[PDB]
């Protein structure tokens, strides 16, 4: 039970008939019972930075004045 | 949906303009922050954006392994009149700096910790004492279970204890411990008192320090030398190297920005003053 | 593995005041729960551990002693207030881990070399 | 069957419990159980704190003594509950407030023991005064004993000091306090503690007055009346002596009018 | 012939595109052929303590009296 | 259908209560423990539970290795007076103390046994003498097999004996031993006599001791040093640590509470006293 | 209904029975009954001989006496029932044997004494000897007193006699004689004859062993300890005493292997 993922790939070789090209995958299997163990996936989210930018009650609209 | 490695939000061509839109204007009293991008004060091109986030999301940004503590242990002579000196040490980020820094940008957290030990060697005496490989024992005492009293006490015996029997000289020791926290999240900071002063009892019965608690009492490590007493005494020293992994944060803080003075949020003085000297129009 | 030191420690009159401090090897209240116990020959009087608060004093004395915690430079100190001529005994410091046994001076592991403190009879 | 007594029984309010062996079941006056305000009897506008759990538990108020020269005992609710956690508080911080109870006397002897105690509930049990010089002018301080409890006596005296009165209440057993016959105190609900069969008393009282809600401090609706129906005699002993415990749990308990807290001279 | 078992998920890696979210699974295959030598599963049971807390002949119902 | 990492019982929402209901009354003379939640005597709310009695199971409570035996051996300069020190060793978990608490709890069991040999050795003598890399010889020399006599006999040869050859300064030495139990479970405990005392022989011939069998008897370890003899003494010491797994028990027993003393469960005078003193009205 | 009651019970095994109306119901170990030896888990391979009836029978062993100063008592199966009967004499006659059991402790006294009794069934009872000098020695025996029983002490008390040791256990009471906790020996199958409850205890043993046939002359799988949890007093009487019965009654016996009569040295 293999997990197979992708790289984001850098400088790619001059190929498309092995590396750069055609998308680049690895794999990785868990060796260990414990989540602890697992290895870090860094295939992370990204959020708004909403609940510190705007931590207003009521809808801002970039163009509109702020306090009317 | 978004992603670490995602490119970041394209750059849309912009040209004049005379409206009753008002982007430049603001009002920082709402304490939301103003969101305006290129396009807004002045006139961009379009661009099609290639940079990400990626090594700057939460596990990235932790993704390195600190040096949480130095330990030292010996193995003297068997006709010393010292005894053979054991490391015992309270688990805790806090003892150095960089580590805690990095950990203060947050209030609070959940993170599997994963441990390296990189161990070294060498002679004390001059003598051209030899001494064979010498091997190592790391032991996780939890809170409140045996402390090891000599170097060689029943203790050691370690029928539920997790020890690391590290041989000297091969690749450095490793293991993972998962989110071991009394919490939900472990507290980086503590605004209480473990015990609260009462009106019926005495100021000593009910006298607790500021700052700390349970949370951030996990056990201590006991470290030895397993070969016993050698001709030749050889020191040692136990470099203990922490890493977060699968880590999560809660509600930034500024980072700490004078020296650091105990495990408490508290200041020394003639280290108060971060900054330095530059004219207000000078560039 | 600790290493205990008395200072601060000497001859005052009766009535008075004095300040004992007690700093220490390593990796200091790693081995935790540090201790004050007088007597010419063995008998406590503070007890305190490395975390939390957490306080209590030996009946004889309760109330005009204070064990308290300097973990940045890793000293246990001890303000001697109000003196009188019984408290001219000779001073130590101690440790040991276990979160327990405060009522056993025999139960430790850890000792300094120590300091003689006089309450002299002037007044 | 599987052992479903009327004298085993177990009472649970919030966090705290009753568990009795010796019971003659338990007492629902007038057939009504406790409940909240309805929206249609409804008086004041405001919202209504339910503290529930934090209100509704039993307190156990002060134990007193039941030898042979005793003559009687009296309570008043929401009085004696006055110094009892947030029930306490809660009230005192309020002008309206209605509140059930569960009245839960205890009393246990042996077999060798004798006689009996009649725990009365009367609904707005007015007691009456001590002297025939000025009526109706019983103080406040006497009037809410408190968890203390008041009283009775077996022969009526009169407060014959005019130059600084008693003003307390001073009543005579066989008249209730109140001038009626005892009797028939019976019609009351009520509970009859007679050593040999049980050792406790139940009485659930629901919310009586002839306002929906009404204000705690000055006004209390229930009395709890516990007078020797037949004296406590011991093998051949002179003087024997068992306790007396009552524990009073209100149920469905609300509050209006939130405002500063309230310092009754209590002396 | 692997044997590949879930783990329970401790601390959730900010992803599901990956790791955390989506069920993790380990691999295992055994090398040698006397059981002895296997690993330790640790996927065991659990089992109603009554064999301990009710030695009892006749059926409890904790509402009813115990004696009757 | 219920395993070691499933959700405990959820906390059900219960209120007031007037019933001819029961819960709180018992009667522990039927041996049965009552069976209480907290839904019963106190109002509780309604609880979705988390936790998992994972790492209580039986599996993991004995998941780690306990220190059974420290062996020592050496090789003396080849003209010592004295014979090259080979260790022989009763195997039983019995001489520490630790494992032997936690198979106390039980009166049998079934479990593979799984072996670790850390090894350790130093110089003995005040001289700058030097030593190669030394080999070590674990053998196993089952019931009424030959036990060597000399550090270089037949024996070693072991043509049937399942030994191992431990390079020192390697990871440590492992194997794995299944039930080798002449039972179905092996008898932490027993109660009688391997001989019956009989009434037409003497009383030297029938008499046996009380608690002993074949049962708990199952070989020794024999370990030297394969290298011969060196111009200077080095020492060596065989720490085995034994870890069981794959296990089950049967029939549970309290812990023991005072100090050991012997193979038997016999205890010593003076380490009566295993409480401490606690008024009756303080807390 | 129709009057099950859990105190009043009746056990029939053979040509006996037993009869109790002041019972706690009755404890089958660890959830398990008697039976007979499966063809599955078999070991040896002769025929088996099951006595039934013959051996499968109520023996009363010899009463002992409980006062204020008794410190407790220790019984051992198949020991005791070495001398009784049929059963007593099958197991002579071999050299393999399994047999469960119905401990049927039996104690009364009145509505007027009070104290608690700890009837305990250890699987594999090994009590400790008697001196710090040398372990494992307790002779054979003292080791099976027999139907008269081994008694527990408040006090160890070492052999100091090397001469000519005694060999016997010196069991303390508040160690269970094993060293461990009195207190945590709740966990073996077990009842409390609390006077004032119940006046007998009932605890149903299988065969627990680590084989599926064992010796029993060698062997002994159940262990039966009483000691006193709480104390006889009774009125103002400075010397209370009454009686201690047990009748253990063997289940499901079988045995294999007959050979000759063992006659085994027991002084
Ligand atoms: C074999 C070594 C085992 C180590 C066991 C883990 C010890 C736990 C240490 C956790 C450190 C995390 C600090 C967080 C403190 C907080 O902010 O509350
Ligand atoms: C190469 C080394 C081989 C080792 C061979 C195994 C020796 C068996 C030891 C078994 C120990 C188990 C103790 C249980 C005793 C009991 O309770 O009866």
């Known amino acids: 039970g293999a997990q197979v993922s992708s790289q984001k790939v850098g400088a790619h070789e001059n190929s498309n008939r092995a590396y750069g090209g055609s998308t680049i995958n690895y794999t990785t299997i868990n060796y260990y019972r414990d989540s602890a163990s697992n290895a870090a996936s860094k295939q992370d989210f990204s959020q708004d930075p909403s609940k510190f930018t705007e931590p207003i009650k009521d809808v801002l609209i970039k163009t509109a004045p702020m306090l009317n | 949906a978004a992603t670490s490695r995602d490119a970041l939000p394209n750059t849309e061509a912009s040209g004049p303009t005379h409206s009753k839109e008002i982007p430049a204007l603001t009002a920082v009293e709402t304490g939301a922050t103003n969101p305006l991008v290129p396009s807004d004060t002045v006139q961009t091109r379009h661009v099609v954006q290639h940079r990400s986030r990626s090594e700057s999301s939460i596990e990235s940004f932790f993704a390195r392994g600190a040096c949480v503590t130095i330990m030292t242990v010996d193995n003297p002579a068997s006709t010393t009149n010292k005894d053979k000196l054991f490391a015992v040490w309270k688990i805790t980020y806090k003892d150095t700096v960089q580590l805690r820094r990095k950990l203060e940008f947050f209030t609070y957290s959940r993170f599997d910790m994963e441990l390296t030990f990189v161990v070294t060697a060498n002679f004390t005496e001059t003598n051209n004492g030899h001494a064979l490989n010498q091997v190592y024992q790391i032991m996780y005492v939890p809170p409140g279970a045996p402390v090891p009293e000599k170097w060689d006490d029943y203790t050691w015996q370690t029928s539920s204890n997790p020890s690391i029997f590290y041989t000297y000289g091969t690749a450095p020791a490793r293991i993972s411990v998962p989110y071991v926290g009394i919490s939900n999240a472990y507290s980086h900071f503590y605004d209480g008192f473990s015990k609260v002063p009462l009106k019926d009892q005495s100021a000593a019965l009910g006298d607790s320090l500021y700052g700390a608690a349970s949370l951030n009492d996990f056990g201590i490590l006991a470290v030895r030398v397993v070969n016993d007493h050698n001709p030749t005494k050889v020191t040692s020293k136990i470099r203990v190297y922490l890493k977060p992994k699968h880590i999560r944060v809660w509600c930034p803080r500024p980072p700490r920005a004078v020296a650091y003075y105990g495990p408490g949020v508290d200041y020394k003085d003639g280290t108060l003053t971060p900054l330095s000297t530059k004219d207000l129009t000078t560039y | 593995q600790v290493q205990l030191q008395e200072s601060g420690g000497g001859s005052v009159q009766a009535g008075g005041s004095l300040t004992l401090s007690c700093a220490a090897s390593?990796?200091?209240?790693?081995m935790g729960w540090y201790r004050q116990v007088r007597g010419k020959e063995r008998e406590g009087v503070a007890f305190?551990?490395?975390?939390?608060?957490?306080?209590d004093y030996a009946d004889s004395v309760k109330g005009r002693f204070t064990i308290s915690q300097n973990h940045a430079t890793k000293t246990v100190y001890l303000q001697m207030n109000s003196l009188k001529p019984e408290d001219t005994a000779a001073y130590y410091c101690?440790?040991?881990?276990?979160?327990?046994?405060?009522?056993?001076?025999?139960?430790?592991?850890?000792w300094g070399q120590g300091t003689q403190v006089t309450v002299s009879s002037h007044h | 069957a599987c052992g479903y007594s009327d004298r085993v029984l177990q009472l649970t309010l919030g966090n705290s419990t009753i568990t009795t062996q010796e019971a003659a079941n338990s007492v629902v006056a007038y057939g009504r159980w406790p409940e909240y305000l309805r929206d249609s009897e409804a008086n004041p506008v405001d919202q209504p704190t339910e503290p529930d759990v934090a209100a509704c538990r039993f307190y156990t108020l002060d134990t007193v003594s039941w030898t042979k020269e005793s003559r009687g005992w009296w309570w008043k609710l929401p009085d004696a509950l006055r110094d009892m956690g947030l029930f306490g508080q809660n009230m005192y911080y309020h002008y309206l407030g209605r509140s059930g109870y569960t009245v839960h006397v205890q009393c246990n002897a042996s077999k060798f023991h004798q006689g009996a105690l009649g725990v009365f509930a009367v609904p707005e049990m007015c007691l009456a005064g001590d002297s025939n010089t000025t009526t109706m002018h019983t103080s406040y301080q006497n009037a809410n004993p408190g968890e203390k409890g008041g009283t009775f006596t077996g022969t009526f005296t009169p407060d014959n000091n005019q130059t600084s009165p008693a003003r307390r209440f001073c009543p005579v057993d066989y008249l209730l306090g109140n001038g009626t016959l005892l009797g028939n105190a019976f019609v009351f609900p009520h509970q009859i503690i007679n050593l040999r069969t049980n050792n406790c008393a139940t009485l659930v009282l629901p919310y009586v007055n002839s306002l929906s809600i009404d204000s705690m401090v000055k006004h209390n609706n229930w009395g709890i009346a516990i007078l020797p129906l037949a004296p406590l005699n011991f093998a051949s002993e002179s003087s024997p002596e068992i306790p007396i415990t009552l524990t009073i749990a209100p149920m469905c308990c609300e509050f209006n009018g939130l405002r500063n807290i309230t310092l009754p001279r209590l002396q | 012939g692997a044997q590949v078992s879930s783990q329970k998920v401790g601390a959730h890696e900010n992803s599901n595109r990956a790791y955390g979210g989506s069920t993790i699974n380990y691999t295992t295959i055994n090398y040698y052929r006397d059981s002895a030598s296997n690993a330790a599963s640790k996927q065991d049971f659990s089992q109603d303590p009554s064999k301990f807390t009710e030695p009892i002949k006749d059926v409890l119902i904790k509402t009813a009296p115990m004696l009757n | 259908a219920a395993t070691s990492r499933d959700a405990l019982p959820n906390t059900e929402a219960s209120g007031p209560t007037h019933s001819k209901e029961i819960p709180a009354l018992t009667a522990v003379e039927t041996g049965a423990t009552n069976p209480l939640v907290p839904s019963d005597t106190v109002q509780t709310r309604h609880v979705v539970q988390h936790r998992s009695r994972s790492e209580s199971s039986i599996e993991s409570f004995f998941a780690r290795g306990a220190c059974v035996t420290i062996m020592t051996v050496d090789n003396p300069a080849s003209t010592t007076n004295k014979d090259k020190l080979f260790a022989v060793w009763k195997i039983t978990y019995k001489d520490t103390v630790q494992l032997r608490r936690k198979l106390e709890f039980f009166t049998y069991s079934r479990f593979d046994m799984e072996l670790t040999f850390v090894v350790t050795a130093n110089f003995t003598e005040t001289n700058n003498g030097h030593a190669l890399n030394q080999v070590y010889q674990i053998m196993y020399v089952p019931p009424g097999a030959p036990v060597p006599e000399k550090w270089d006999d037949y024996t070693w040869q072991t043509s049937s004996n399942p030994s191992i050859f431990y390079t020192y300064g390697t990871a440590p030495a492992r194997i794995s031993v299944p039930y080798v139990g002449i039972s179905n479970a092996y008898s932490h405990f027993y109660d009688g006599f391997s001989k019956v005392p009989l009434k037409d022989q003497s009383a030297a011939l029938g008499d046996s001791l009380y608690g002993a069998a074949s049962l708990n008897d199952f070989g020794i370890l024999a370990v030297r040093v394969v290298n011969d003899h060196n111009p200077t003494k080095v020492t060596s010491k065989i720490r085995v640590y034994l870890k069981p797994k794959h296990i089950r028990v049967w029939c549970p027993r309290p812990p023991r509470a005072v100090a050991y003393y012997g193979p038997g469960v016999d205890y010593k005078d003076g380490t009566l006293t295993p409480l401490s003193t606690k008024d009756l009205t303080t807390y | 209904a129709c009057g099950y009651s859990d105190r009043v019970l009746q056990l029939t095994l053979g040509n006996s029975t037993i009869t109790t109306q002041e019972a706690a119901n009755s404890v089958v170990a660890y959830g398990r009954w008697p039976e007979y030896l499966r063809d599955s888990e078999a070991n040896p391979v002769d025929q088996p001989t099951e006595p039934d009836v013959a051996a499968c029978r109520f023996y009363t062993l010899d009463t002992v006496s409980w006062t204020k100063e008794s410190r407790g008592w220790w019984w051992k199966l198949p020991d005791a029932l070495r001398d009784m009967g049929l059963f007593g004499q099958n197991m002579y006659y071999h050299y393999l044997g399994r047999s469960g059991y119905t401990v049927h402790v039996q104690c009364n006294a009145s509505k007027f004494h009070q104290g608690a009794l700890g009837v305990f069934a250890v699987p594999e009872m090994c009590l400790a000897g008697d001196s710090n000098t040398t372990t494992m020695h307790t002779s054979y025996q003292n080791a099976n007193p027999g139907e008269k029983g081994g008694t527990f002490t408040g006090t160890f008390t070492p052999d100091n006699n090397q001469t000519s040791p005694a060999r016997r256990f010196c069991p303390v009471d508040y160690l269970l004689g094993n060293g461990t906790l009195l207190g945590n020996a709740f966990v073996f199958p077990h009842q409390i004859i609390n006077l004032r409850t119940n006046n007998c205890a009932t605890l149903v043993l299988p065969y627990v062993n680590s084989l599926s046939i064992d010796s029993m002359v060698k062997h002994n799988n159940w262990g039966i300890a009483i000691l006193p949890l709480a104390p006889l007093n009774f009125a103002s009487e400075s010397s209370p005493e009454i009686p201690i019965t047990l009748t253990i009654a063997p289940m499901c016996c079988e045995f294999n292997g007959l050979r000759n009569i063992t006659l085994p040295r027991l002084q």
């Open positions: 305190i551990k490395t975390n939390d608060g957490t306080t």
């Open positions: 101690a440790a040991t881990w276990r979160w327990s046994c405060p009522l056993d001076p025999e139960g430790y592991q850890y």
């Open positions: 390593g990796i200091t209240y790693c």
